[PDB]
Amino acid sequence: LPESFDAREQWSNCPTIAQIRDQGSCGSCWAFGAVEAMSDRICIHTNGRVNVEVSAEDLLTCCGIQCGDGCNGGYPSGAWNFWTRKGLVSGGVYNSHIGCLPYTIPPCEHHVNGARPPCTGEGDTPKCNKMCEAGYSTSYKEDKHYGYTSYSVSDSEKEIMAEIYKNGPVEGAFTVFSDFLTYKSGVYKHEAGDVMGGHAIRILGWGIENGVPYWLVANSWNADWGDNGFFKILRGENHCGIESEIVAGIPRT
Amino acid sequence: LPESFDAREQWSNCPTIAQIRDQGSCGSCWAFGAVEAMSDRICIHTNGRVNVEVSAEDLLTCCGIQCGDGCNGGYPSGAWNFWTRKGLVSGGVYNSHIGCLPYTIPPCEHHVNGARPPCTGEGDTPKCNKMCEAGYSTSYKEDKHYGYTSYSVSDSEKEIMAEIYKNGPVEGAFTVFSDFLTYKSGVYKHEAGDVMGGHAIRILGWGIENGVPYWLVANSWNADWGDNGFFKILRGENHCGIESEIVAGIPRT
Numbered sequence: 001l002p003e004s005f006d007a008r009e010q011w012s013n014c015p016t017i018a019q020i021r022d023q024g025s026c027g028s029c030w031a032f033g034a035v036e037a038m039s040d041r042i043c044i045h046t047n048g049r050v051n052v053e054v055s056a057e058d059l060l061t062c063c064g065i066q067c068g069d070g071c072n073g074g075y076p077s078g079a080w081n082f083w084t085r086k087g088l089v090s091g092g093v094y095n096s097h098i099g100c101l102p103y104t105i106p107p108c109e110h111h112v113n114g115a116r117p118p119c120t121g122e123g124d125t126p127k128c129n130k131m132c133e134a135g136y137s138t139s140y141k142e143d144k145h146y147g148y149t150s151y152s153v154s155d156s157e158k159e160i161m162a163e164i165y166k167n168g169p170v171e172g173a174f175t176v177f178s179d180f181l182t183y184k185s186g187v188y189k190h191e192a193g194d195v196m197g198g199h200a201i202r203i204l205g206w207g208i209e210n211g212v213p214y215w216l217v218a219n220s221w222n223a224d225w226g227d228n229g230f231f232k233i234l235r236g237e238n239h240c241g242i243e244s245e246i247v248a249g250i251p252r253t
Numbered sequence: 254l255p256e257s258f259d260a261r262e263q264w265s266n267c268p269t270i271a272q273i274r275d276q277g278s279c280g281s282c283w284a285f286g287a288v289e290a291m292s293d294r295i296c297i298h299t300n301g302r303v304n305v306e307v308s309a310e311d312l313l314t315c316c317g318i319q320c321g322d323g324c325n326g327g328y329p330s331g332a333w334n335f336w337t338r339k340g341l342v343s344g345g346v347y348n349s350h351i352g353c354l355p356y357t358i359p360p361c362e363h364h365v366n367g368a369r370p371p372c373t374g375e376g377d378t379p380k381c382n383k384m385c386e387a388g389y390s391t392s393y394k395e396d397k398h399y400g401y402t403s404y405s406v407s408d409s410e411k412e413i414m415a416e417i418y419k420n421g422p423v424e425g426a427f428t429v430f431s432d433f434l435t436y437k438s439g440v441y442k443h444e445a446g447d448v449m450g451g452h453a454i455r456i457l458g459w460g461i462e463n464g465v466p467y468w469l470v471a472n473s474w475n476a477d478w479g480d481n482g483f484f485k486i487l488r489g490e491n492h493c494g495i496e497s498e499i500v501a502g503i504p505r506t
Contacts, residue, residue, distance in 0.1 A: 065491075065492070066490055066491045067491075068494070075491060075494045075497045076497075077407070077408035077491075077496075077497045078408065081408055150407070151407045152405040152408065154330070154403070154405045155328075155330035155333075155403070155405065155500075156334075195326075197450070198451065238318070238319045238321075238328055238330070238331045238334075239318070241331075243330075244329070244330045245498065
């Protein structure tokens with residue numbers, strides 16, 4: 001395995017890999033890390049042939065109890081199961097009008113200052129509506145993309161790197177302390193700060209910074225939070241549980 | 254797989270299986286659900302020839318960063334990793350004077366009106382003394398029991414059932430709402446209450462009670478909580494994430 005590896009470069013023909021979304025005022029990181037990683041892997045596994053943005057909106061709103069409580073939180077491995085059974089329709093970002101169900105919850109500022117309204121944290125979960133927006137070419141049922149398999153990856157550094165390196169970014173989760181909120185650059189090691197619970201992400205690579213090993217991670221807090229929306233978190237120490245809750249899956253291709 | 258299965262009935266020569274512990278005023282769920290299931294599995298693996306209580310004190314104090322943060326919470330899969338790498342010693346309950354390092358934190362009342370002192374928030378992780386209790390036959394080192402492998406079990410009802418049936422109890426985890434705390438009997442389905450966090454537990458069976466499928470689970474809040482320290486929780490719909498974070502492991506021979 002390589003000492004450093006970036007999925008964005010390994011499959012540069014696959015643009016979802018490089019994309020930072022914004023979940024909005026809805027705690028649906030669980031839904032975002034999955035559909036981000038599923039998009040990436042539908043592109044990787046058809047070798048470029050198929051490139052969709054999988055709908056964050058379909059997952060979030062139509063999964064139900066097996067996934068969690070929507071905007072209030074949920075479970076990654078419930079998401080990848082849903083994909084495998086009921087599939088996910090396409091849906092681009094808010095107001096993109098791309099795909100069946102683009103996301104209906106607007107961008108907002110996530111522990112940063114900018115032009116977008118502050119995020120407000122409390123946000124209703126949209127009802128499940130099994131219908132593509134007006135204009136879309138196909139019907140909801142037709143637009144479903146399916147998972148062939150889902151699985152957890154064991155807490156093994158070398159096993160996590162081999163899975164990404166072979167098959168694409170993963171969804172993971174980690175415990176979020178308050179000192180993470182203000183990450184700008186470099187490798188995140190939790191030091192000060194209290195605990196704000198566990199949070200799901202997409203892991204898309206690894207590398208070495210000043211000797212400190214790290215994981216290259218996409219947050220779903222828009223591109224103005226952190227390092228253009230990405231963060232590096234310390235690798236090899238189960239640091240804040242980052243090597244504990246890896247889930248992934250192979251598309252029905 | 255049978256309609257129902259109890260690890261206690263199946264490996265009745267192994268008494269740790271039926272045993273309930275008390276973690277005291279220390280959020281070390283992660284440690285208990287581990288060392289309970291390893292105890293069972295050492296006993297099951299050896300056909301009962303080896304019957305020890307794996308020390309919750311050793312794992313809690315000596316694991317370090319990879320397991321999380323001691324009495325403030327931690328990660329199950331780091332526990333089982335450490336077990337395969339460093340091993341874990343014998344240690345009975347508080348004042349048991351059984352084994353190398355019994356537990357040094359005393360029993361207390363977890364959300365129930367009994368006679369032990371109420372439990373005193375969370376505590377402070379002890380230091381790691383790599384020395385057994387004065388009076389113990391063997392050295393710390395000579396007292397280590399090693400895991401051969403540790404691994405995550407995927408979010409699959411049938412998979413999780415087959416693992417328990419073939420290898421014995423597993424550690425799991427789930428989100429806790431306020432309405433859990435006053436469980437007495439029957440099958441717990443979350444209907445109301447505030448979140449409190451995900452907490453680690455040991456799963457040791459399943460069955461059906463009045464139409465509803467469940468998991469037989471052991472809490473580490475002593476025997477005056479719940480149904481003799483035990484509870485049942487809805488099975489088959491990833492309820493409070495119960496099927497999402499399953500870890501386990503094989504004892505070294």
